Ligand binder design. Structure first.
Ligand SMILES: Cc1ncc(COP(=O)(O)O)c(CNC2(C(=O)O)CC2)c1O
Ligand SMILES: Cc1ncc(COP(=O)(O)O)c(CNC2(C(=O)O)CC2)c1O
Ligand SMILES: Cc1ncc(COP(=O)(O)O)c(CNC2(C(=O)O)CC2)c1O
Ligand SMILES: Cc1ncc(COP(=O)(O)O)c(CNC2(C(=O)O)CC2)c1O
Ligand SMILES: [K+]
Ligand SMILES: [K+]
Ligand SMILES: [K+]
Ligand SMILES: [K+]
Ligand code: NA
Ligand code: NA
Ligand code: NA
Ligand code: NA
Lengths: 431, 431, 431, 431
């Protein structure tokens, strides 16, 4: 039983609490789209862990690779190159759109964003960073300063030159021009204000193609193109944070491919390492060249370590070989349609959004007032788990609670059906 | 041969340069205190990789453990607990001095320092951070703002409330009271200045017990005790960064044990993961309790992931079981004495310092003027490698180039002898 | 002649240029609504100098008072009180709305705003300051950080916690809700964004009732009431900068009286000193009490000096006795109607706005496209002067050039007519 | 009587308290080196008001000049030049050392320092400002950020890039090299630390030749020369704040003349206006030229107003004509010797320092322990006033209370004797 008093005594006694609450089970094993508790109860992992288990838990190839290098080439002095590092860097260049040539292989998402923000600052000679008011880039210094969905209070001033602009949210529109929600005019309006505040040091804009932590908010048609233009006109770099959207999850290898807009710096992390700590930034030869001329520095312990890189290489290997990107579209459509049927049945579902296998379900009280359902989400979230479905809802100011659904790209048709099943029972049960 | 033109073409074409230069070899394998090149040439790893390979490369137990969990329990939603996390947290409490009770398991050193600085800020309601002018805590935002040995230029303003004080450097003394280098008076003097500048928001002091990147500078007798008092008197937390000094390297399990001063927050990383990306902060129950009351947040992708934690657990397991801490003292003494004999032979060696298996050798021109040897270090560094010895020199303003020596705690007596050998030949050859 | 080569040689050789250009005349004398050049040519001062000559130039009573104290009580140690200081402080309490009780008598407008911002920061324990993107509060540190109409570039980072929101500009509307320019919804929208960026340290909002430098932009009906509510809800003080609007210029003694909204801190300066350097802040007994408890400090050389204070006292004396406030309404109506007749004649006049004797005329090219007239303003401005009328146009991004008209409250009916005359001739001539 | 209950009721009811306490008298008149109370009691003004009454109170020539322009040329639009402005600017160029050519005429000391700091920032393209830990430059934003003797707490973060270094204080030495107080080595030591913290954006150093608020601390021989070199080597401007030292007070027209070191920007204020609000910055033609090219802006209400400028012109006129500079040396010597005789009599006088008519007397308990006399100063200060002598003591951390003595340069021999008399009686009485 998960009721181990010794276990719980120790957790309570010696663990730093870092946000949220700990689930009241002891996870003993993981395999595929499932995690198993102390009792052996299977919990369908509909969030891919912390949205990282792209190939699901303990993928046989991952296991082989890990063991493979665990005992061959593990960690090295950061000035030393090895084959998995060069092969991974080469692959990343090869699969990203034209204009992205060179990579830096790191350990975490926040770290990847910090490396990119630092590079943007060096190269422009400027320092003000612009992000979305609903963004999430990490907990570390720069990454945090650019995070507005949470964490900005009680911890001192943010980085000097921190600005946010509102993200375009079609479900809950707030800017109109002739009865219509003009998200492009809003963008213009937002930048005018920025221009007036700036000290003349705009260095970059950082963005998620789809704001996950933010509420599964997809940037609408033509927006990214418009944003890049705004950056271009001001001498700013565009940094795209694809921690959650990269590596096939949305149906394209990279979210920026769908829009056809290639950023100046691309960051990857969660999906790339497939549960392991690996991250990266990819930039153009030109930007890297200037950063170099200028003495760019981002020297860490694990930068360019062979093991994680070797892991990243195999992950891309199987995503491509198993056509997991297309898969994401087909399973996504199946999962998406199911959610819509649920929305046909329950008035508590106000919106179903997202792309590929990065979906969101926004819970409301009045499916006309679009009033956030106070506590209903937590209840639902609660019943799912009883029911054996791991979910994750996010609650932000002014919106309804949002369920973030992101199962492994390896998820089965039966597994998708299971989740839909359980979700309905959880709903009817929580109401 | 390491001369693979394809390999080198790809590195050049697709790798972001991040500091320093890449060694001109292709590392194919690693095992024990050695790394092997494309030709199979063995290079004695005298820096333990990036100072992380505590049990040396590909330790059989590490390999077992990694495989062991790679296919059992890998990555999880951050709200889910598992046994390796709780066992590791418990162990850390158990082996650290009294007053350190709760741990947060992360991925990188910089991340560990950020988590601690953030917590210190939350708990005090303040934000100014004090570090050493020769410090090194990482490349990320907060960690960088507190790093003064390098990286502060061309990348915009530092974090608001950033101050440094000079570190006590006995080799190159700069503060005197009655003909004597009074490092305590210097400390008093440094704090008076701080007091005058502060906005009344001093939150914490962050320090390395031994400044590695800084030049292998050991805080002299009674200093840490004096510093903690200075912090105590001002309502500041003391954060000790033991990324390089923790896990037995200096001869005690933790460097703070030797002085007998226990910090408010302890950070670990490099040595803890043994080449893998794992890091941690340990704090007191009281501080964690207040952080909690206050809504502390440090929620990341890999926080509390079982695999790395399981790795950390085994590392501590073998350090204790194989008495690697004592070992560090005995091999250190052997390595230390050898360096002293070299210093008997060569006038270019001005100082041999450090503790246990964290040693430094400062190169000079006039062993009386203590004038930094311009380029001699690089030459030496160069000859070592030809000779088959991986070394690392650090060059800071106003000091001589310093070799940072830190071989695995598993290093053999013969391996230590080998290194000394090669080092002398490299010296006589570079002069 | 103004052509004095010696004079011009010296100006060129020894004057620091501080913005704009120097008029090419030598002003020898001033009296009433006129300034006289080297040739004796009378220039009708339609801007009251730098918008300060409230009683016009060299008012007989001002002259008496100045002489009167120049030789009786001049300057004192700042800890010493005298009668004019106490009488002025008492008067200010007496003529401001209920809720404003205590005054601090200073020297400049920027200084007055700094004193208020500092007090707001002390009292709230917070530091982020919110202003209008088209604001003008001064050139000094804090006052500058809160100024967005200009001066933010090439001079380093602004004060930490600096935010701006768009000012409601009815002529050039930019926020709509059902075909209508909803300036209140815009206000709501602006504050939501603020909320998301803030570090939880909002201290105050600073505003001009009518943005002078900004383009003679009057806050529309119900706005100030809404803004104060926004401040109230967030624990922020409302600071009203009436440097240009105070002392009767707009038709009420203080602009805040018209709206009926009394700020937490009121600042005055330009009009108060009537050309002389005197300024003030007035706050509530409660706020002053807390500032005191907390050790408020704003100790300067001229704070509480009798001479300027004695000047300020007489200025209020004659404004009240001569009913200059009502006068402002009657002469304003006359001046206003004239401007409207001009706008009937010339398509280049797109808007006539303002209140009392604080009027603005916005120049455009297409009185339908409302396109800013490129250079026409400068031409007009140029012809006026030839014609003998001192005017002042302000050119801001996205708007047409705006003439800021503000003649002495003592201006005559004939003088108003003269100005209108000259203005038409200048127009017909510049086209 | 000063006991006017109505007066005191009003002061209490309507005055903002701004630091210190209000003297319990009502100053009715001033003339020469005296201020008179409600009862007609003469108080010898030994601080020249707030250290501004250079020609003493209500100087006949000042009175004439003020009246003279009060009714001729008063205040003007800031783009308009007049003769007193050009004559004053010309004079300043003419009497300052070679290398100072152009002036900007403002209203306050803080404003003058802000104008200079802003200009330094524009011209260097940098922003970090370095000052003395015991400095006093004003209460406004930038000026405050550079002030370390007080006011840094409870009012939010200082300006980004604010650093201080210790001022050389010979009475209380703290840095030694071979038993000797090496203030130059201290300076070197201070700059090394600065170098390590800086973000590579050092713009200027701001300093008082003699720190008044700081405790009458005179920069020792060769220091300024060394400091300018430190600035020169780093591309920093040297800003000299002579608010208290300028216009003859120290025995030379400007304090920087004695050392022979001419700063890049010179600021003046207190003494210049002789009690009235006038201030200035003087810079080199080259610096002004670059500031201009770059769009320097420091446009205020009273910049270039004829009245104050006309006042400043007459002040310089009589200082030169009456040889008040030499006078300062002769009366200073008389005042200085007297203080030394007092120090012969009382063990409570630990030090007599300063230059010309800018003197300081540091009170101690143990004239061997040099222990600050706790409360004795306030008592003395108290008895002086009873006795009819206005004094001003400053109490800073780690030093004894310091009396700041600065009587008008017009002070009489009898007046100096009177003060010495009263001071001794006050001492013997307060002990
Ligand atoms: C005391 C200390 N603290 C933190 C760090 C940063 O850890 P990461 O590089 O894993 O984030 C280092 C290492 N610094 C490097 C070095 O060896 O110089 C890797 C660069 C460290 O030594
Ligand atoms: C777009 C994006 N960028 C960076 C990160 C931070 O990565 P790390 O947590 O590994 O540093 C997240 C994750 N954020 C969390 C979430 O799922 O809410 C883990 C907290 C991310 O989504
Ligand atoms: C060197 C120096 N620089 C600037 C100033 C500020 O000038 P203002 O007070 O007129 O703005 C002072 C005065 N400071 C005070 C003092 O005598 O302590 C008036 C407070 C000054 O001494
Ligand atoms: C609302 C408001 N607040 C403060 C100030 C600054 O006052 P000072 O210039 O006397 O310090 C102005 C004036 N600004 C100027 C203008 O007319 O544009 C003089 C420049 C002001 O209008
Ligand atoms: K590495
Ligand atoms: K996790
Ligand atoms: K005063
Ligand atoms: K003026
Ligand atoms: Na590519
Ligand atoms: Na412990
Ligand atoms: Na009132
Ligand atoms: Na000169």
């Amino acid at each position: 039983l998960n009721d181990d008093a010794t276990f719980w005594r120790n957790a309570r006694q010696h663990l730093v609490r870092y946000g949220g609450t700990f689930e009241p089970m002891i996870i003993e094993r993981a395999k595929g789209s499932f995690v198993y508790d102390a009792d052996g109860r299977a919990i369908l992992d509909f969030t891919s862990g912390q949205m990282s288990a792209v190939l699901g838990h303990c993928h046989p190839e991952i296991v082989s690779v890990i063991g493979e290098y665990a005992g061959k080439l593990d960690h090295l002095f950061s000035g030393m190159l090895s084959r998995p590092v060069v092969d991974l860097a080469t692959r990343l260049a090869n699969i990203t759109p034209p204009g992205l040539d060179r990579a830096l292989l790191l350990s975490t998402g926040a770290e990847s964003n910090e490396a990119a923000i630092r590079m943007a600052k060096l190269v422009t000679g400027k320092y003000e960073i612009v992000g979305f008011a609903q963004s999430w880039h990490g907990m570390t210094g720069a990454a945090a300063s650019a995070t507005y969905s949470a964490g900005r209070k009680g911890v001192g001033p943010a980085a000097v030159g921190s600005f946010a602009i509102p993200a375009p949210f079609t479900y809950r529109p707030r800017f109109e021009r002739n009865g219509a929600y003009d998200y492009l005019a809003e963008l213009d309006y937002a930048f005018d204000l920025i221009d007036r505040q700036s000290s003349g040091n705009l260095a970059a804009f950082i963005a998620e193609p789809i704001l996950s932590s933010g509420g599964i908010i997809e940037l609408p048609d033509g927006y990214m193109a418009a944003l890049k233009r705004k950056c271009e006109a001001r001498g700013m770099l565009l940094i795209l944070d694809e921690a959650q959207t990269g590596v096939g999850r949305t149906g394209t290898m990279f979210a920026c491919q769908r829009d056809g807009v290639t950023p100046d710096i691309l960051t990857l992390s969660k999906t790339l390492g497939a549960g392991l700590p690996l991250a990266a930034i990819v930039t153009s030869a030109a930007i890297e060249e200037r950063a170099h001329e200028l003495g760019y520095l981002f020297y860490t312990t694990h930068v360019s370590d062979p093991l994680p890189a070797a892991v990243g290489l195999r992950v891309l290997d199987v995503v491509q070989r198993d056509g997991l990107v297309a898969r994401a579209n087909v399973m996504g459509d199946r999962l998406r349609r199911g959610l819509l049927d649920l929305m046909e049945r329950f008035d508590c579902i106000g919106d179903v959004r997202g792309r590929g296998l990065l979906l969101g379900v926004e819970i409301v009280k009045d499916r006309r007032t679009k009033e956030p359902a106070d506590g209903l989400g937590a209840k639902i979230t609660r019943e799912c788990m009883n029911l054996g479905l791991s979910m994750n809802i996010v609650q932000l100011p002014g919106m309804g609670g949002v369920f973030r659904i992101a199962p492994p790209l390896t998820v089965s048709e039966d597994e998708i059906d299971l989740g839909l099943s359980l979700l309905g029972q959880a709903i009817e049960r929580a109401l």
